[PDB]
Amino acid sequence: IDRLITGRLQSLQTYVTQQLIRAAEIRASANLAATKMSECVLGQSKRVDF
């Protein structure tokens, strides 16, 4: 049972770390989308290819 507990705890830790990294990437993309909402829809931007 100690061996099985160690294995399942390792798998859960790996899943939590992968979820944290994916959440950071999703937060960066959401901040970019919020900037595009504030600058392209609520105004007119002079930035090239933005």
């Binding site: 294995g7 390792q10 798998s11 790996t14 992968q18 290819d49």
Partner: protein, 50 residues
């Protein structure tokens, strides 16, 4: 080692997801280089009179 491989098969699919993460990093690097450098549609050339 055959005995080590037979004991390693009991540990599950840790290495499949490690290979998946490394493959994701590998395709992400090429995505980054393509996104930075390949922004022009045509390959322009300078006229020979400098």
């Amino acid at each position: 080692s055959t005995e080590c491989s037979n004991l390693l098969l009991q540990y599950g699919s840790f290495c499949t997801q490690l290979k998946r993460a490394l493959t994701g990093i590998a395709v992400e690097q090429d995505k980054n280089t393509q996104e930075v450098f390949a922004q022009v549609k045509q390959i322009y050339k300078t006229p020979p009179i400098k």
